[PDB]
């Protein structure tokens, strides 16, 4: 089993990105074992901070490092994603010399109401994360626009083409992770 | 007098970005009044506080409705900008239906020690506040790496080149917001 370090770019009580997680925590049980980030206690990032580090920056440093992976679940707002999720992506790149990131095998997906299915905020958090050293991964694209009809309370994909097609990007993942991961 | 709704982007003690802000003050005044929006004391974006709005959401909001123009001044983190900059942006476009951005002539600057001079930072935040319906001023160009001897402790710019580069940067502000405002 792999274990993946995960951000999900919401807070919000019924958000469809943590919907997603779900559904792709269980249809990779057996084979990657999600550990949560916990991007949301993160203070905004200053630098004077590190003369007493938070201890949610702390915790997050350490279980990136010990995770295999990194996956990163986004909403689009505005045509990119979420700044909660950069202020994770640059705390955790320091302090200077320590970046947590690097040589981690990384992924992105994430959804939305729309068509666009977040596409425009996945672009740019794949760039982002490739910035800060991660050996992303690029196939097969998962722009999810989210059909509420498609998934079951338990986090099961009742509909097959979308189940095919979250299998699919599972698969390329766990791949990716033996392949290009230390 | 024109007001300007204000993002720096660095919350830290002897903050570059923060010195820059009081130069470009400095330099502006009669001609522009600056005025911070407080992105800092804004919460991580969380779509059920609507709720009941947190008052510095509703104070950020009420500041830029009523400037008549928005300067963002950003440090570099990792080749993009800070993810607290785009959380105030966020915070501002919503509820749906209410974008305090539209419409607002804005210019983006900042400085990094370094030589690039937070220009890919730069980059993605014009873009970012394009996307939001600013009426973007792109030039010229500032991409500024801070040099402490080109400036003096109550904000003048003691070097000549450097006077007449962000003389001309504020002239340009000016004028577009002259021109591209309401
Ligand atoms: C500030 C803000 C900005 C945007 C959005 C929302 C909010 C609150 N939403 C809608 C978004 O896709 C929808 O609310 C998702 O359901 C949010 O994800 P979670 O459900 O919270 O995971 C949105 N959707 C979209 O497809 N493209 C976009 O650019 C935006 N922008
Ligand atoms: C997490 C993080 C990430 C980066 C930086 C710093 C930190 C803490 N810095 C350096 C930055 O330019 C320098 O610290 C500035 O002085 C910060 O701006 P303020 O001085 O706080 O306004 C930095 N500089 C740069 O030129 N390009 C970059 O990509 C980064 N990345």
Known sequence: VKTVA???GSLRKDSLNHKLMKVLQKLAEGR???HL???GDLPHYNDDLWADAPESVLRLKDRIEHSDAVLAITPEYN???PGMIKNAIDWATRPYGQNSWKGKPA???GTSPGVIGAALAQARLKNDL????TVMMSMPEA???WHAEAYAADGSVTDEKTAKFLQGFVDAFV???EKHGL
């Open 6 to 8: 995960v951000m999900v």
């Open 79 to 81: 045509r990119s994603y």
């Open 37 to 39: 980030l916990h991007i």
């Open 143 to 145: 722009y999810i626009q």
């Open 130 to 133: 490739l910035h800060v050293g």
């Open 32 to 34: 990657l074992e999600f």
């Open 107 to 109: 992924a992105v997906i």
């Open 175 to 177: 791949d990716w992770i």
